[PDB]
Each structure stands twice: as structure tokens, then as C-alpha cells.
Amino acid sequence: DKTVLDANLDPLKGKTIGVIGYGNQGRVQATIMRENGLNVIVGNVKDKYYELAKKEGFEVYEIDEAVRRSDVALLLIPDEVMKEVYEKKIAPVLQGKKEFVLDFASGYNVAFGLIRPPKSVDTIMVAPRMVGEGIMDLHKQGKGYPVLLGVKQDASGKAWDYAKAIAKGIGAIPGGIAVISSFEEEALLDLMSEHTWVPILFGAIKACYDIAVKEYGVSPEAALLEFYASGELAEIARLIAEEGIFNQMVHHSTTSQYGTLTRMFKYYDVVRRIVENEAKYIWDGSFAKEWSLEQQAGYPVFYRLWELATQSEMAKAEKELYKLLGRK
Amino acid sequence: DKTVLDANLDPLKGKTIGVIGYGNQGRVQATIMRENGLNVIVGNVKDKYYELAKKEGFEVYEIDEAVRRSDVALLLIPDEVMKEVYEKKIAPVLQGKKEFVLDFASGYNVAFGLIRPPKSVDTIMVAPRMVGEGIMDLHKQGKGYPVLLGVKQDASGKAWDYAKAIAKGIGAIPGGIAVISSFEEEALLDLMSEHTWVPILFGAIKACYDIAVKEYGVSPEAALLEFYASGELAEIARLIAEEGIFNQMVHHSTTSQYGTLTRMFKYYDVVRRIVENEAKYIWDGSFAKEWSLEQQAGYPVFYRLWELATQSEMAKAEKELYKLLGRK
Amino acid sequence: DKTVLDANLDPLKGKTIGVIGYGNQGRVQATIMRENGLNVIVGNVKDKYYELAKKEGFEVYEIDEAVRRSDVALLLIPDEVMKEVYEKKIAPVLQGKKEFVLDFASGYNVAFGLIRPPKSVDTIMVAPRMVGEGIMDLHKQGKGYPVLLGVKQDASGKAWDYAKAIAKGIGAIPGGIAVISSFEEEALLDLMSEHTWVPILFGAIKACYDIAVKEYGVSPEAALLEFYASGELAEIARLIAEEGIFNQMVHHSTTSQYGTLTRMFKYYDVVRRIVENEAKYIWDGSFAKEWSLEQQAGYPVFYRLWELATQSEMAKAEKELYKLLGRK
Amino acid sequence: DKTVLDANLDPLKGKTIGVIGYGNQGRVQATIMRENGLNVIVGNVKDKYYELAKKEGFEVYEIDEAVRRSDVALLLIPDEVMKEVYEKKIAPVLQGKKEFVLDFASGYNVAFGLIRPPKSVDTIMVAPRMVGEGIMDLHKQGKGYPVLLGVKQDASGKAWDYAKAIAKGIGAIPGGIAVISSFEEEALLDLMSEHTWVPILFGAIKACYDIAVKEYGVSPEAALLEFYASGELAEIARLIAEEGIFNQMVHHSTTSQYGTLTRMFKYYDVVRRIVENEAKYIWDGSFAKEWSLEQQAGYPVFYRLWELATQSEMAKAEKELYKLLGRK
Numbered sequence A, B, C, D: 001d002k003t004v005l006d007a008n009l010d011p012l013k014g015k016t017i018g019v020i021g022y023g024n025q026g027r028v029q030a031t032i033m034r035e036n037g038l039n040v041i042v043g044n045v046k047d048k049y050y051e052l053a054k055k056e057g058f059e060v061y062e063i064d065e066a067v068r069r070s071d072v073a074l075l076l077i078p079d080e081v082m083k084e085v086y087e088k089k090i091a092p093v094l095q096g097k098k099e100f101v102l103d104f105a106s107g108y109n110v111a112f113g114l115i116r117p118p119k120s121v122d123t124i125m126v127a128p129r130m131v132g133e134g135i136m137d138l139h140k141q142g143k144g145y146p147v148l149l150g151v152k153q154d155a156s157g158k159a160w161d162y163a164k165a166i167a168k169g170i171g172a173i174p175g176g177i178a179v180i181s182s183f184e185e186e187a188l189l190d191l192m193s194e195h196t197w198v199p200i201l202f203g204a205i206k207a208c209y210d211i212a213v214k215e216y217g218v219s220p221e222a223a224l225l226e227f228y229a230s231g232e233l234a235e236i237a238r239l240i241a242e243e244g245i246f247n248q249m250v251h252h253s254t255t256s257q258y259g260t261l262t263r264m265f266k267y268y269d270v271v272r273r274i275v276e277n278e279a280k281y282i283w284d285g286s287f288a289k290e291w292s293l294e295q296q297a298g299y300p301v302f303y304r305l306w307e308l309a310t311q312s313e314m315a316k317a318e319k320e321l322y323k324l325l326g327r328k
């Protein structure tokens, strides 16, 4: 298949590497690749993480300086502030380079053209599929984990080799796997989850609550217990991740299976239409525009919605309850 | 009629003139009006065009300085960057003036209020209808060419005279003609072409290709030949510009005439509705907003569409083909 | 690929060839194939072209006689009168044959069954994609040009060889290319152009004119200049034929690109529906019926539409104008 | 106004005139213009009318011969057979002419292009608005009558003079009037009457009958009396032609006026839509096509409808009744 399981590590031996940011990801990847025998540095502004990283045994310079000393760099910072950082501090230093390599963990700012590096550069991508708290929990066991790979600009005919070398340097393989893809096929996915089934799920739950209360005389303290205040859902998520989504259902009662299957095959076209609409909205680049503009205006909608959600009835009831069960 | 064929040239004799930009238009108008005996200068930042213009015999200062020495100025630069240039460098110098004149080749930035000069100023407009490469090709023959005229702000009761004098100074007349109009009636037109029949044409061609291939088993190498890979279309354009749009069709076969006429009178209401929608969208000023905002966000949609078009199947086939016919 | 670049010429050496009609095509193909060393004759009724052809060095007999002396024939006459000519003069002579070959430049009258030659005959097709005025302009340079090939009836297992030999005899190759296709895949194309984007374009232009005049107070003398009275369109056609349809747009301004792309991807489904309708109307054979019947009635609709178009307002304004610019 | 009341008669004095057909119109116009002192002949095939016309004192030749001896001709025959007559017998003789004039009483065959005379000819039109039986009934009183005039082709700058001279020669003026119009504005009218209010009227009557019988238990012998078997309707027609359409209603009862006016202003949009549809169907030339084709097929629809109408129930009842009242 397209799949990769293990590969070489020679192209990075002798080269210096710079890691931007020391948040969750940066700390993790940096520590690991240090264990695998690589000269590593860090670039960050003087704050909490700066002290922490220099404490953990890392030589710390600030960003532009780190890019001067590096032949490779990992830009592990939020997708909301990477633009200014790149424009002010990196791009200059980068114009003054010969053979450089630039890695990202997300393809948002590139797939949509908010960042357009030169042609003197190898532009790549390495995207894990784990939060970071569990990634360490797995590295201790010699286990790997999955990632996605992508290449946007090859100026040296060696980009893929570099990407696989990186994947190995951070402990994703061997033990896990690595898939080859694009920047687009990753942004698309990271977004479609956040736009299709998460919000649909939440709205469905909220609607069930509202209905049961205002049309069948149910008590608030019970709806919550049935819907999400119990650990029903994490159970199901686990059995899904392990046994499979459908085979997970054998451990339930026949009645549940029947209702679930019927109503699933019954409401499939509706959500399909929805998903089409949203995926199309993304592929074109409209959502990026929307979001950037909202940033420029002052996040008013964000504010008002955060209010409306918490000032809803369900949330207040949840509050009273969690307090009652002792859950902080 | 409203029409003008030739006029005087006295108001500009004794005055100095400054031309902003030395691209296609600026170079042309400047050279010509120099031939017609006028003291002329140039304003531009130190780049390629700067060297070229000083080479061709023009005294070159940078912009604000040129506006100080000038009683008249031609703002011949793209409509996408004129705003900042006007705000930073011109408007100050202009506040410190007594009797000035400002000419544009496009009414976009003014019709929509992105540029609001003072009342101490005569604001005019001179818009040709030729690319510039052919304008010289015609000036050598003593031929004129058409233009549009407009006036937004008259502080001296002499604006129209100035406009006609300019039209004569650049060689549009006599030999061609000059129409009086507004800034609005020019922006509207320059846009409606770019929003109605050009994109409709392209979409129709693309649809014909896709259909013929995916439903009637046609080969890609043939659809292109019929639709646009042949010089069919430039032929028709020429006969239109010369003989007339309809009289052009006499040189075709009766079958073609019949089909064309029937389907034309048959699909006229649809496109009419479309054109209404778009013209209305413009008259109000919504498109300017849209475009300005996209500039402020980072041109994401522009990017994604440029990609989707070139990564289409038709374009790849066109590529293979053009390479085969030797066309670069 | 399916494509052909050059081939043999042996099957026609020793055979006599008859060319029907001496209009644009006939004259061209005849002259050329004569240059390539082939015994050639001509068949036509005694009129202007008759004198011209005998002047240019061709032995001229009238039609049935030419078919008697020929082992191969090219039926290069309009698709509107070929039927009677075939029925009265050719088919008899043809019943009295042994091994014959019949070539067409269009598949209309055959694809739809208005002409059904016997099985004693090899029925083929050779369709150029150039007007004829430029074909000579290219033959002088040793250049070729594209054509389409097709076969309807093979009684000798040598039809394709004959077709390629012909293509070579008229100077299409080498230098150009030749595509293999059907009679249907050529009629379909020659028509879909005349039914989809040409009339749509014209209607869109007309609608823009009408709107701009009757709802925004524009002058007629300006709308025309923007829309087609300028050579805007032939420019674009040229850049399309040479650089490519989309790459052509880089030489325009960003604003134009943006509007064009957006409105193109926005109005693609509509025209797609239209094109489906028309292509289907053709594939079935309904348009041929329509057109034949109109011929039988006396061309009343043709007449009335030719009137309505020229008695429109746009045409009268165009007339006044062209007269003013001196354009005949 | 556009209107004409009397005019000269000099252009026809000294010229010979030929009248084609001796039916209702031909007989009338011929007799009259003979009374007004004009050399007149007749052209017709040897049948009943031939004997009649030669009896009434007319020198009779057959058609082509009459056109040779004539400088002016009146083509007074049905619009269904004029085409062949023109093609076979007239057009030849006409090619061999110098200065000729051709008059019609209907613009059908010309407005739609079924007859296209040369440019060596003056093509005109004179259309009365009376059946012919009453025209004589009025000529005896020295009264005139209305007509329409039109010109399609002027080769002598004298067409209008000829038309008015004709109008005077047939006794339409003075006493009546003459309106200037086109061939189109006459065919359109002659048809729209036959397509809009006549058939609507008939269908409404038929529907009233059917309803009253099959839903309110009415007797057939009474519905007819109310609807049309009485002379109600000719009364109203007379008062319309004399007093005016609306002023006609004062002689009726208030109840009738009220109902009529209300329901008239209530059902005006519907019939307006209908009339638009039909007038458009005509202006384009589609009805002429329809009718010509039906002639070519054998009048099957005509046949079947003539049957269905007479085999209806209303017609049979009308038959029984008329027989009962003695009405033949």
C-alpha cells in the first residue's frame, strides 16, 4: 500500500535542528529526538516555557538566532499566531539561506496560502494523531503512533527522505505507521470533524434535553444522567477504538441494535447533504476568510455564543448537579 | 450627439505636467504628449521602470516632489495600490495647493469613495479602450482611438476643457473619438464584462468538454480542437470588430445561422436575469467591499481557485496537447 | 495514444481521384494533393468555379462522368444540397461499381441516415479544423494542421490506410496531427458549438447592453466600446489559442481574475444543464428533423429572426457608430 | 395624424392594369375601377368565373399573358395557392420586366418570406376591412370604406403614390379612410382575431351549455335559446359598431352592467397572458410553419377536429332545434 512502517535516519546525522515553541508538542518531540541522538536547540520568547526548557537541559536562543544556526526547523506553534512570527522574524533570515528545510504539524496556513515560503526551501509536513499526553505514555513502552506526511515544495529531491527521517526521530515509527498525503487532505480532515459530527452531536443532546423537559414533564436531574452525565459515552468510544465501531454493539441489547441500525440507515442522506455543504465551503477557502476576518473585528460572535451557551438552562442544571455529585 | 471629435489644446500650454507610473499606459501617454510639445516629468520609485524612463529622455523625480512641481498630474497606476500612495505621499502635498488638476484612467477608487480629494481640486477622468500595445501601433499611422471622459468635481468651470485638451494631447483625437460619461458608468462597464460574459463563456466551454467526454465517449484531444485549441474564435472576434456582430454570420453556413439564432432568442431571459443580479450587486458597492476584505485576509479564495482551475482535467489535457503541437 | 503523426501514401499511387466542388475546401485540397504527385480531376456544373478550376490547370468534367473515371471521390460541397446531388447523379453510377471509396468532410448527412451508400463501398471521413484561408497560409511553411478521421463502412479492410493516405495527401501531416473518431463524434461537436456558447455569448452581450442603457442611464456609444466594438475579444482569443485558456489571464489584473473565477465556478451548473439538454436533443436526431422541415416550409422563422436581430436597437447603434469610426 | 382621406389618381392614367382572380374581391375592385375610367383586363384559368367575367364585359386572357400586357397587377387569390401560381407562371415573366408594380390584399405570404420578388419591382399592399358583399352595398351610395396600406420594396420612390391611387380607384376614398402600416401589422391582426377572442368565445359558450346541462338539470332546448339560438348577439354587435362598445351597455339593465364590468376587470390578466403567448407565437413565424406542414401531411388534424365538433352533443341538439323552428 501507500503505507510506511520504518525507514532510515541518515540525512539528519551531522545537521543541527531547531524547535520553535516548547508547548505540548514541542517539548515532546524535542525530548524524544534528543534521546535518539540528535543535536537540538530551541527558540522561544522569554517566558514560562523558556525557563522550563532551559531547565530540562536545552540550549535556548530566541527565534531568529535559532534559525540562523539550524539547517532544519520545526514550527510547532498555534496556527493563529504563526503568520506574524513568520513574517517578522523568519522570512528575512530565510531569504539569507542556501539549503533549508521547514516542517509543520498543520497545513492550514499553507494550504490556504497565508504562508508562501520561497523556492530555495524544502517544505514538508508531519502531523500526529494524538494529543501529546498519551504520546509519552506510549513512548515509554517502545510503542509508535500514527502520523501523516506531506510535501509542498521540493528543491532537493530528498524531501520524502527527510520526512520519514523526522517521523523516526520523534518515535512514531517503528511501532506505529506513517501515511503519505497532502497539506490539503489534512486541513480538510482536521476541520470536517470540528464542523460536522461534533456540533451535530451536541445539538442533538441539547435538543433531547429541551424536548424531554418541556413536552413530557421530565426532571432536569434525570435527562442529564441518561444523556452525558454518566460515563456511557467514554465506554462506547473505547470499545470503538479497540473492537471496532459496529462490532462494539454486540455487547448491547438487541433492542438497542435494532433501533440504532434502522434510524442510522434512515437519516443518512440528510447528514450527507450537510457534510457535502461544509466540505465544499472548506475546499474553496471561504472558512479561512471568515475566521481571519472575525479575528480582525474583535471576536464578537465568539463572545456572544460563548455567553449564550453557558447561560442556557442545560448548563445551569449541569452546574447544580456536578456540584451535588462533588465533581469539581 | 454627445460625441466629440477634436478640440483645443491651449489650457495646457505653459503648464507643467507630471505622470505617475511608467508602466504600459504611463510610458505611452508620456511619450506621445511629449511629441505634441509639452513639458513633462515623471514620478516613480527607483526600480526598473525608473531607469528605463530616465533613459528614454525623461527627467525623473520621486512622487511627492513631482506633484510639487506640477499643476497637473496623471495617476496611472494599478487600482489596487493607488490608495496608500495617495494617502501617504500625495494628499499632504495636495492640501498645500491652490489650483490643481487630477486625472485618472479608472473610476473604481473614486466612484466607490475610497479616494475623496478636496474641493480645491478639479477631478477628472480619461479612459482609453485599448490595451496599449496597439495604441502605439495606431499612433504611428496618425490614427486616433476612443476614450471616455468624466468629471467628478469642478472648482474652476474649466474641467471639461482640460479633459478634451488631455484627450488631444495623448493622440486619441483627431482620428478617434471621445465620449462624455461618469466615473460610475465606466467602472460599471469595466466590471460587468469581467462578471457576465467572460466567465459564462468559460464555464460553457468547460461544461461542453466535460459532457462530451463523460457521456458520449469522446477523446480529449478532439474536444479541445473543436472548442478553443483552434483559432476559430479570434477569427470571429475580428469579423465582429470589423463587419459587425450579426453581419459576421453571413460567411458561415445556414445551419449554423439557424441554430445560433434560435438558441440565442431561446436563452436570452436567463442571462438577462444573471446580468441584472450582477449589475445591481455592483451599483450598490458590495463587490468593492468583498474584494477589499479578501485583500485584507490574504487572498485565500483566489489561491484555492487558481489551484482548482489548473488541477482540472481540461487543463492537463490542454497541457499535453500544446506540448505536442509545439506551442510553448 | 490514439494519435497519428505521419503515415504511408502507397494506396493512392496508380489510382485516379475526383474532387467534387471547387469552393474553398475543394480548391485547397485539390491544389495541394496535385503538388504531392497525384492524378486529379474535378467535377462541377458549368459556373464561375468551373472556369476558375479549368484555368488553374485542372481537367474538368461534370459530376457523374468524373465518378465513372475515378476510383476515389471527395464530396466537398455544402451539407444542404449534397442529398439531391447524391441521389440523382451519383448513386446510379455507383450501383455500377466494383471497388470504390467515398470521403466526406462532414458527418451530418451520414450520421443521421440521410445518405445510405451500399455495402460495395468504403465510407470514410476527413474533417479539418481550419477555415481554409489559413490552411494555405500554413502549407507554404511546410506546416501541417489537425484533422479528424472516421470510418462507417469497411468493405476492403483497408479503409484506415486510405484515410491516413488522404490526410497526408492534403498536407495535414506531417507537421500537424490526425485523430481517429466517428461520424457522430464530429457532427455532435460541430453542432454543440453552434448551439451552446456562441448564442449564449451573444445573448449575454445583448443583455448587458440593454440593461446598462435602460436602467443605469448609459449612452449607447460607450456600451459598445466596452463590450465588442473594441478588439478586446480577438486579443483574448489569440492568447487562448497560444498560451492557454487560464494562463492567458495572468496578463490581466487581479481584480479581473478574482471576479472571473468566482462567477465562473458560480454559474457552472446552469450552463451544464443547458448543454446536457442540447446535446441530448442532437444525439437523438431531432434537430436534423427540425432543420429539414424548415427547409421544406420556406425558411419563415429564419427570415423573421434575421429581421428581428437587425431591427434591434443595438444593431442600429452599431451601424451609426461603425459609420462614424469609418469602419465600412 | 397618420391618416389619409383622399389623394391623386394621375400615376395610373395611361397604364394598363391586370386583375388576377375574379372571386369576390377581384370582381368588385375590377368593376369599380372600370367605372372610374381605367383600362382593365383579367387573368384566370378557364372555369366558371372565366365565363362570368367575360360576360360582364372584361377581356380575358390567362395569367402569364395578362402579366405581359400589364404595368400593374393585383394578386387577388387565396393565400393558400398563391405560392405555386407565383412560382410557375409569374416569376418568369417578371424576371423579364423593367418597371413593374405588384399589389396584395394580404401580407401573409410576404411577411413570412414565402414570396420574395426581385428588387426591380415595387411591392405594395392594400387591405380592405369589409367582406365584399357590403362593399358594393356602400359604393352605390357614394360611400367609401377603410383600408390599410403598406410598402415592402420601393424601387421607384413612387410606391406610396401608387398605393393611394389604387385606394382611390377602388372607391375606398373619398368617403372612407386609409391607414399606412406594414405587411406584418396586418397579418398579425388578421390572425390574432382568429386565435384569441373567437375561439375563446366559442369555448365559453360550449362550456356554459355543457355545465348547465350536466350539473343543474337544464334542458338542451333552453340553453341554446339563451346563449346563441336567439339574435341577442347580432344586436349587440350592431350597437357596438354604431354607438360604441361601452356606451352600448346603457340600453341594458343595471344588473347586467354591474356583473359585466366586475367580471371583465376580474378576468383581464388571464386572457392577456393568452394573447401575449399567441401574438409571440406569430411574430416569430411558427404558425406559418405549422400550417404549411399540415398542408403537406394531408390535413389530418383539420379532419378529426371538424368531426369532433359536429359529433358533439351541442351540435346535434342545435340540429334538432333549427329543424323545429323551420330554420334551414
Ligand SMILES: [Mg+2]
Pocket: A190
Ligand atoms: Mg484542530
Ligand SMILES: [Mg+2]
Pocket: A189, A190, A193
Ligand atoms: Mg481531529
Ligand SMILES: [Mg+2]
Pocket: B190, C253, C256
Ligand atoms: Mg479592468
Ligand SMILES: [Mg+2]
Pocket: B189, B190, B193, C226, C232
Ligand atoms: Mg474591458
Ligand SMILES: [Mg+2]
Pocket: B253, B256, C190
Ligand atoms: Mg458547421
Ligand SMILES: [Mg+2]
Pocket: B226, B232, C189, C190, C193
Ligand atoms: Mg466549429
Ligand SMILES: [Mg+2]
Pocket: D190
Ligand atoms: Mg383571414
Ligand SMILES: [Mg+2]
Pocket: D189, D190, D193
Ligand atoms: Mg378579420
